[PDB]
Design a protein around this ligand. Structure first.
Ligand SMILES: *[C@@H](C)[C@H]1/C(=C/c2[nH]c(/C=C3N=C(/C=C4\NC(=O)C(CC)=C4C)C(C)=C\3CCC(=O)O)c(CCC(=O)O)c2C)NC(=O)[C@@H]1C
Ligand SMILES: *[C@@H](C)[C@H]1/C(=C/c2[nH]c(/C=C3N=C(/C=C4\NC(=O)C(CC)=C4C)C(C)=C\3CCC(=O)O)c(CCC(=O)O)c2C)NC(=O)[C@@H]1C
Ligand SMILES: *[C@H](C)[C@H]1/C(=C/c2[nH]c(/C=C3N=C(/C=C4\NC(=O)C(CC)=C4C)C(C)=C\3CCC(=O)O)c(CCC(=O)O)c2C)NC(=O)[C@@H]1C
Ligand SMILES: *[C@H](C)[C@H]1/C(=C/c2[nH]c(/C=C3N=C(/C=C4\NC(=O)C(CC)=C4C)C(C)=C\3CCC(=O)O)c(CCC(=O)O)c2C)NC(=O)[C@@H]1C
Ligand SMILES: *[C@H](C)[C@H]1/C(=C/c2[nH]c(/C=C3N=C(/C=C4\NC(=O)C(CC)=C4C)C(C)=C\3CCC(=O)O)c(CCC(=O)O)c2C)NC(=O)[C@@H]1C
Ligand SMILES: *[C@H](C)[C@H]1/C(=C/c2[nH]c(/C=C3N=C(/C=C4\NC(=O)C(CC)=C4C)C(C)=C\3CCC(=O)O)c(CCC(=O)O)c2C)NC(=O)[C@@H]1C
Ligand SMILES: *[C@H](C)[C@H]1/C(=C/c2[nH]c(/C=C3N=C(/C=C4\NC(=O)C(CC)=C4C)C(C)=C\3CCC(=O)O)c(CCC(=O)O)c2C)NC(=O)[C@@H]1C
Ligand SMILES: *[C@H](C)[C@H]1/C(=C/c2[nH]c(/C=C3N=C(/C=C4\NC(=O)C(CC)=C4C)C(C)=C\3CCC(=O)O)c(CCC(=O)O)c2C)NC(=O)[C@@H]1C
Ligand SMILES: *[C@H](C)[C@H]1/C(=C/c2[nH]c(/C=C3N=C(/C=C4\NC(=O)C(CC)=C4C)C(C)=C\3CCC(=O)O)c(CCC(=O)O)c2C)NC(=O)[C@@H]1C
Ligand SMILES: *[C@H](C)[C@H]1/C(=C/c2[nH]c(/C=C3N=C(/C=C4\NC(=O)C(CC)=C4C)C(C)=C\3CCC(=O)O)c(CCC(=O)O)c2C)NC(=O)[C@@H]1C
Ligand SMILES: *[C@H](C)[C@H]1/C(=C/c2[nH]c(/C=C3N=C(/C=C4\NC(=O)C(CC)=C4C)C(C)=C\3CCC(=O)O)c(CCC(=O)O)c2C)NC(=O)[C@@H]1C
Ligand SMILES: *[C@H](C)[C@H]1/C(=C/c2[nH]c(/C=C3N=C(/C=C4\NC(=O)C(CC)=C4C)C(C)=C\3CCC(=O)O)c(CCC(=O)O)c2C)NC(=O)[C@@H]1C
Ligand SMILES: *[C@H](C)[C@H]1/C(=C/c2[nH]c(/C=C3N=C(/C=C4\NC(=O)C(CC)=C4C)C(C)=C\3CCC(=O)O)c(CCC(=O)O)c2C)NC(=O)[C@@H]1C
Lengths: 172, 194, 162, 289, 162, 172, 162, 172
């Protein structure tokens, strides 16, 4: 996988040149925001169960046919598999937030997942809707100011939102 | 009857990779390291992910786990018990054709993709002739398995990621879910939304 | 590409677990090291040409036969000298990459992996590159964390070569 | 007795070796034979240099000033014995060596370790040696005029645990009790503490898998708890001890000694795999049923 | 036992390589967190008994039926109340262990593995323990890195129970 | 495996009691020793090839019987295995130094190593002599006053020396 | 799926042999039990609404807090009661499926597999469903083999839950 | 796979209601002929080798090109493979007769068999002819009145014929 530093390293090595001053300054600015990235990762991790469960309940309320008999979320095993999948997507989006680059999320979770859900009959659009609900809940947890040093976390929130809709597009 | 002869195919595992340990090197979960109970939990979960992708607690084999913890059995024996377990038979054997059961056996025991359709065809007769456990033991006693994972190491997808590349081959749990379109249409999915 | 961040994610993913406080502390240590790594990379970059030229001259001085005997693997002619300068520049550039990344990953997959068969196939003596890296260690003029981390990468390359 | 497996073990030379008794009004060869037997058995087949020989004790035994039992006591209390067996050994190993030399048997249980360790700590080494030699067991086996010898065969007050532990203490005829693989480590501390036994592995030249020794931890247990269930359909399970595993090389091979519980149906495959890994089979013991 | 140091050594040992600068930064992050973890464990330990009784009282308040329903699994008698306070004390003590160790390792080793079987067979609602952990979060009175790490362990337990 | 903190934690859980103030202060003192420990680990790691090669050269100079034909270090594969064993033992010594506990060295390296060597015919006493030579070389490297903040590393040096002693006693 | 016929053919297929007298005896046992199982399923179906209503009401009586405290997992509102009655209906309907099939297989594949995950994720106490199943036990009005088979399935569900 | 009961159960669970009275009556009807089903399975199992050998002999009699050199049934290995596939197809139709649902036969034997025969060059039409020969022999053996309590076995014979036809059409 690649992280935020290593992405720039890989482009520079492909071009076979040293990192320029501007690239090093950009990485220094990335280092400057590392605390916000770590605590956003921590906040999502500490609220993962609530995010997954609330998003799932909202999804089955908006799409009752998922949980009605014959639905893809009907029966306990299918319902638990769906919850697990929500949690897996959330965990890999936290990985991507932690590294600062989407390589782990694509390589380990997203790439080929659409074909997996096509092969299983899992409605990928409904998975995308679930991922959007997780995104909404997760952005609320990252953005709440209680019990934390106040600051501007808009850049990291935008990066997290980008990872989440990337997951939603990948499963659709 | 001898197995059909099938030609190999160019693969990363067939060739020397000059690998240096990194984030893409699969973690070696081995009982040779005298693992504590929490490290054994990690090793056991690695075996569950390799064999069943995910194991609900209905799918867990607590008797096998206790036996592996006590040293009664090796890691390879635990892998065999996972493959002979009810979860594996119901999810991967029952819901798939024999050919797509050889795949889900080559992929997660040997840690490599099948060479071709011919390999799938050749190994698919083994269940009906030598028995299910016959196939499991043939794959576990194979030179490929013993040379790669031996008795004490959990198998894994081998050489998935080449160095420097952003993405390697698809993980087998993504590439090959438990069932495919045959059992999908037997179930009645895909379902229309709205 | 071994770095602290990617290894923390690999450890958490190999156990199927979210990122706990252990991984967060790994990221905090990475943040503590990163500014020194970036300034070390900048210092090596600005002095790259002089360091590469001096390392090449140190290798030529310690192994004078390289500039005398003919052969594809030697620097008797301009072609071999250009190849040697290019190789030493490769080492210095990949070390700066490692300083940026925070691990030996750039060295691991751009340079260290397979370098044994490179040296054997083209009859390149690893002691030449060892002396070039030693010169880079002696003349990079770094201090504090910058030096310690850069020297860790340089000794990592030297240990891989010996 | 031990007949078919005597040569494989180190028992065959002791089968035709009669006990060395000093008769009343003995000759000088009888005295020298007693001296030679005592040196060989009490000092555990160590080479005895001329400068280390107890000249005075030998003279006294030759003269009849001391009995065979007294000469054995003098040898066991000598600085030569303490240098060879006491000063560099854990006291449990000292007890094992005492039982092997003075009584010709292995310790039976942890109670003997308790008694001898307490006696050494409270009254010294000489008193402990005396307890070995003034024991009822010593008197009934050797008495006053017989050199102590290895008691391989079954006797009246035996336990079979002692028969198994004898081959943990004795490692062949051309072996010297300070030249064994485990060196100075106690061979029976775990066994006596846990009241357990080890599969008997014979001496080097008669047994290819002679060098097998279990590690400190990560050892396969003796019995197959769980039966044949982890092995699918299987008839019977066997614990196989394998030594000298080297072919794949590190890191594929971590420990050169490995114990595996395998089904009967995989025994052929297990043997072939052992041959491939360059190993030697030390023992095979039924593990189920 | 998950810790930054044991994970770094386990990653290096699985890769069969010497500890690199990546693992050194892991140790640096552990050092950065360890002092605050130690005073978090001290502060939690000093106020442990009061925190445990308050969490017990909070659980009884949110779930009144636990104090007036007969059965072995409830706290309607003194025996049950004692076992409830003991369970909450176990949670608190193992959280202090996690703060000392710098990871969720003590929780995984001593409490997380097999807690679901216990709560199922003895018919114990995990929501009670979740409420106890919420009270401990709300009343441990920590700040800064101590607060963050401690709340991470308590939330790890809450997520494990939910 | 165990590190310095988790050993105290395991003992405390076995007693079922919170860590005492003395134990917390001792761990704080260990934390204050952390930079010196990291320096020792890095110094042994940076000279690992020199330590292994020089110790092996000295060992085969003092014990020529190892490298004469018929000796255990004779033939290229057995020589390579020997050098590798020395590097592995050094690596696990650094693991024990890094964690502050000998559990990794005992469980993963020294468990069964004596039995392995006697089963293969590898002379364990000569392995202990080679480990001794790595010990003196590595301790001289750790105590080098050049290019490092001066301070007292005697406790770290003693701990590292203890790890080497364990390795040498175990292999012999 | 666990059913006498499916396992007989499954176990014969997994070891690659023709059906023998043993599978014939398994089919004979299935034939002996089948009429009673079908009659039990019919009886449970005929007053399924009364059984489900009584079981849900029994759960509300033993656990009044479920109808009083507000929450998504509770039945204080009509939405919670509807979810509860639907869950009890699932339990009873799958029990009738097991009676028809002759084994606990419908319960295993439709309800039991990953029921633990359900209850933990949505904070649904398994004791609630245990009390519902005990009401179904005590009020189905079955006799002979029909009662014994149906109670075996209900106790199977209880044992999985408890 | 399914059996005669689990198929109805699966359909009902997918549509989410109880088995109707008519469905229960049909299943009670099916358990009334259960003895005849067990008789049919036993008779085919007890004469499997004769059925396979006679059908193979007749097939190679009317289709000599299969056993001519270069034919698909030429050489001992390929001929044994042909006899094997006949025995396996017969065994799986006995499984289908036993469970009362063709699912085992469909899932385990006929799924992908035609594509495999195409890939190997096995003539699927000749396999269909051979299994039709097994059908005529097996139905004669099931319908044999000697040594059995006389009854109407037309329904079970029709079910077995349907299984054999389905196996023939999978490869034809
Ligand atoms: C946007 C995401 C929200 C936000 C974040 C924010 N955090 C900080 C500063 C710090 N956060 C931490 C985090 C931790 N300390 C620990 O020990 C652990 C446990 C493993 C964690 C997660 C740290 C160390 C700091 C620095 C010290 C401090 O307390 O300030 C900032 C301040 C700027 C900075 O980057 O340092 C900000 C902005 N704040 C918001 O307002 C958002 C809701
Ligand atoms: C068509 C299939 C043929 C046929 C069948 C037939 N059989 C019965 C009755 C029985 N057959 C059995 C069978 C077995 N008993 C055993 O112990 C075993 C071996 C394990 C077997 C296979 C049994 C138990 C019965 C019931 C008792 C009885 O003998 O009557 C019938 C009678 C009706 C029924 O459905 O039971 C019939 C019709 N009869 C034919 O004419 C066909 C050629
Ligand atoms: C939930 C929001 C939706 C849903 C989910 C659903 N998924 C499955 C089954 C599988 N999902 C996976 C997932 C992954 N494989 C990977 O390797 C990773 C990345 C690391 C992921 C995300 C797989 C492999 C399966 C099949 C195996 C298994 O489930 O154990 C199911 C059930 C399908 C089945 O019966 O097998 C379901 C229900 N379905 C919905 O209706 C929601 C919209
Ligand atoms: C050299 C003349 C050219 C070149 C080569 C190149 N190849 C690879 C990578 C691989 N090569 C193989 C090939 C085989 N595998 C087989 O099974 C067989 C038969 C035994 C062969 C020949 C494979 C599978 C790989 C990938 C695995 C691995 O590299 O370890 C590379 C590396 C590509 C990368 O991204 O690392 C290269 C560079 N490249 C050139 O420019 C030359 C023209
Ligand atoms: C300089 C210290 C000595 C020297 C150099 C020399 N090198 C080569 C040839 C090659 N060098 C490399 C090395 C690398 N390629 C890479 O991509 C990287 C990693 C990023 C490295 C380190 C390689 C692969 C070659 C061979 C292919 C090529 O020509 O590029 C030569 C020429 C050898 C030949 O046969 O042409 C020389 C001369 N020569 C000296 O005398 C110095 C002491
Ligand atoms: C000489 C060619 C080589 C050599 C030999 C050497 N051997 C020992 C020690 C012992 N040798 C034996 C062998 C026997 N004792 C017997 O009773 C029998 C016949 C049944 C045999 C074959 C024993 C048992 C020992 C140990 C007893 C003792 O007192 O040592 C040593 C001594 C080792 C030491 O003192 O540490 C030596 C030196 N050494 C060489 O270098 C030659 C190649
Ligand atoms: C006291 C602080 C702890 C304790 C002690 C304890 N030890 C034993 C038993 C034994 N201790 C030994 C020790 C030695 N053997 C030697 O050779 C040497 C000196 C060279 C030593 C130190 C041995 C061999 C035994 C076994 C024999 C015996 O039991 O006396 C026990 C008894 C164990 C039992 O169950 O019998 C005890 C109690 N126990 C604690 O709880 C303290 C922490
Ligand atoms: C007879 C039913 C079978 C049989 C027996 C057999 N046993 C031996 C030898 C020994 N038996 C023992 C057993 C014990 N020793 C004890 O001290 C105890 C009680 C506490 C027991 C149970 C031992 C240790 C031996 C060897 C020592 C000795 O015999 O003194 C043999 C002789 C083997 C040989 O001569 O090599 C035999 C024949 N053999 C059969 O075939 C019967 C099935
Ligand atoms: C308190 C929040 C509620 C409550 C408590 C209660 N608990 C039990 C019984 C047990 N609790 C445990 C838990 C643990 N044991 C451990 O070792 C650890 C990990 C370190 C934990 C978390 C266990 C195992 C039991 C059962 C055995 C035992 O008694 O120790 C009970 C009694 C249950 C019974 O007697 O069957 C009770 C009452 N009760 C309430 O009402 C509170 C809301
Ligand atoms: C070098 C100082 C001495 C020496 C060494 C030597 N070792 C071997 C072979 C092996 N060494 C190991 C090592 C380990 N196993 C572990 O798990 C650990 C800890 C992680 C270690 C260190 C193993 C497993 C083997 C066997 C397989 C292999 O060779 O890799 C040899 C080869 C022995 C042979 O003949 O096969 C040698 C020579 N020998 C000396 O003479 C030195 C004193
Ligand atoms: C002890 C064996 C020798 C010694 C050690 C020593 N080191 C420090 C201080 C530091 N060392 C480091 C280490 C690193 N910084 C990096 O970036 C890297 C690479 C990742 C490493 C290895 C750090 C961060 C410090 C603290 C800041 C500083 O530069 O001083 C000390 C001082 C006290 C302290 O513990 O911090 C000491 C004593 N000094 C000797 O004299 C011994 C030979
Ligand atoms: C009734 C005894 C108690 C109760 C019920 C209640 N249940 C839910 C939610 C769900 N119930 C299930 C269960 C199943 N689904 C299946 O397909 C099957 C197997 C065939 C079972 C057993 C599931 C999966 C859910 C969640 C999904 C859904 O929205 O239905 C709720 C709502 C929980 C929530 O957060 O929305 C409730 C209220 N509540 C009580 O108070 C009773 C004591
Ligand atoms: C005989 C009637 C005809 C015939 C057959 C024939 N088949 C093969 C080879 C294979 N047949 C299979 C069969 C199956 N796969 C399954 O999963 C199932 C269900 C359990 C079945 C029945 C397979 C997989 C193979 C290939 C593997 C193997 O043969 O071991 C051959 C051999 C072809 C070859 O050797 O190249 C033959 C000859 N051939 C005829 O001419 C008859 C008409």
């Amino acid at each position: 996988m690649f992280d935020v530093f290593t992405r720039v390293v890989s482009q520079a090595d492909a071009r076979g040149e040293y990192l320029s001053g501007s690239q090093l300054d950009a990485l220094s600015a990335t280092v400057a925001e590392g605390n916000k990235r770590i605590d956003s990762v921590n906040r999502i991790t500490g609220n993962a169960s609530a995010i997954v469960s609330n998003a799932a309940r909202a999804l089955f309320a908006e799409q009752p046919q998922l949980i009605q008999p014959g639905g893809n979320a009907y029966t306990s095993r299918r319902m638990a598999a769906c919850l697990r999948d929500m949690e897996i997507i959330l965990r890999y989006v936290t990985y991507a937030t932690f590294t600062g680059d989407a390589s782990v999320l694509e390589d380990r979770c997203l790439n080929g997942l659409r074909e997996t859900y096509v092969a299983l009959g899992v409605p990928g659009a409904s998975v995308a809707a679930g991922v959007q609900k997780m995104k909404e809940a997760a952005l609320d947890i990252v953005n709440d100011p209680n019990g934390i040093t106040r600051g501007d976390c808009s850049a990291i929130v935008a990066e997290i939102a980008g990872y989440f809709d990337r997951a939603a597009a990948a499963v659709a | 009857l001898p197995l059909l002869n099938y030609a190999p195919k160019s693969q990363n595992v067939r060739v020397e990779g000059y690998e240096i340990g990194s984030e893409e090197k699969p973690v070696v979960f081995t009982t040779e390291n005298i693992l504590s109970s929490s490290d054994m939990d990690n090793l056991i979960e690695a075996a569950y992910r390799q064999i069943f992708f995910h194991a609900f607690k209905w799918d867990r084999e607590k008797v096998l786990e206790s036996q592996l913890r006590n040293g009664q059995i090796t890691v390879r024996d635990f892998v065999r018990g996972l493959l002979l377990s009810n979860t594996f038979r119901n999810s991967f054997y029952e819901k798939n054709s024999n050919y797509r059961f050889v795949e889900h056996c080559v992929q997660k025991i040997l840690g490599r993709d099948v060479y071709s359709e011919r390999e799938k065809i050749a190994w698919s007769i083994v269940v009906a002739t030598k028995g299910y456990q016959g196939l499991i033991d043939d794959l576990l006693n194979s030179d490929e398995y013993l040379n790669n994972f031996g008795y004490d190491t959990v198998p894994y997808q081998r050489r998935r990621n080449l160095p420097g590349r952003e993405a390697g081959e698809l993980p087998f749990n993504i590439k090959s879910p438990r069932y495919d379109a045959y059992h999908r249409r037997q179930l009645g999915f895909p379902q229309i939304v709205w | 590409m071994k770095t602290p961040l990617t290894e923390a994610v690999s450890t958490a993913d190999s156990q199927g677990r979210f990122l706990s406080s252990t991984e967060l502390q790994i990221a905090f240590g990475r943040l503590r090291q990163a500014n020194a790594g970036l300034q070390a990379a900048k210092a090596l970059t600005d002095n790259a040409q002089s360091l590469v030229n001096g390392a090449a001259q140190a290798v030529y001085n310690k192994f004078p036969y390289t500039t005398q005997t003919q052969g594809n693997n030697f620097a008797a002619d301009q072609r071999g000298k250009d190849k040697c300068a290019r190789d030493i520049g490769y080492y210095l550039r990949i070390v700066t990459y490692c300083l940026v990344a925070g691990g030996t990953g750039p060295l691991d997959e751009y340079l260290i992996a397979g370098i044994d068969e490179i040296n054997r196939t083209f009859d390149l003596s690893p002691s030449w590159y060892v002396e070039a890296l030693k010169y880079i260690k002696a003349n990079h003029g770094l201090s504090g964390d910058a030096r310690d981390e850069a020297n860790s990468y340089l000794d990592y390359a030297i240990n891989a070569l010996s | 007795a031990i007949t078919t497996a005597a040569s494989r073990l180190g028992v065959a030379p002791y089968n035709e070796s009669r006990p060395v008794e000093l008769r009343p009004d003995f000759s000088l060869d009888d005295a020298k034979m007693v001296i030679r037997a005592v040196y060989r058995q009490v000092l555990g087949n160590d080479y005895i240099m001329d400068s280390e020989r107890l000249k005075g004790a030998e003279s006294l035994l030759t003269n009849g000033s001391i009995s065979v039992r007294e000469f054995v006591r003098t040898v066991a209390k000598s600085e030569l014995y303490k240098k060879k067996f006491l000063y560099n050994n854990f006291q449990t190993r000292v007890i094992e060596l005492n039982y092997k030399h003075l009584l010709g048997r292995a310790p039976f249980s942890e109670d003997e370790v308790i008694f001898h360790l307490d006696l050494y700590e409270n009254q010294g080494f000489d008193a402990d040696i005396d307890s070995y030699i003034d024991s009822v067991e010593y008197q009934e086996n050797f008495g006053e005029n017989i050199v102590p010898y290895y008691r391989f065969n079954n006797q009246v007050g035996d336990r079979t645990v002692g028969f198994t532990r004898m081959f943990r203490l004795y490692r062949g005829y051309a072996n010297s009790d300070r030249s064994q693989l485990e060196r100075s480590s106690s061979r029976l501390a775990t066994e006596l503490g846990q009241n357990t036994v080890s599969a008997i592995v014979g001496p080097s030249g008669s047994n290819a898998g002679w060098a097998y020794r279990p590690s400190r931890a990560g050892n396969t247990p003796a019995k197959a708890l769980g039966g044949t269930v982890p092995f699918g359909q299987a008839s019977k399970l066997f614990r196989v001890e394998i030594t000298a595993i080297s072919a794949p090389g590190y890191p594929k091979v971590r420990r050169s000694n490995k114990a595996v519980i395998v089904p009967f149906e995989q025994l052929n495959q297990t043997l072939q795999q052992i041959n491939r890994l360059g190993g030697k089979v030390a023992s095979i013991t039924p593990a189920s049923l």
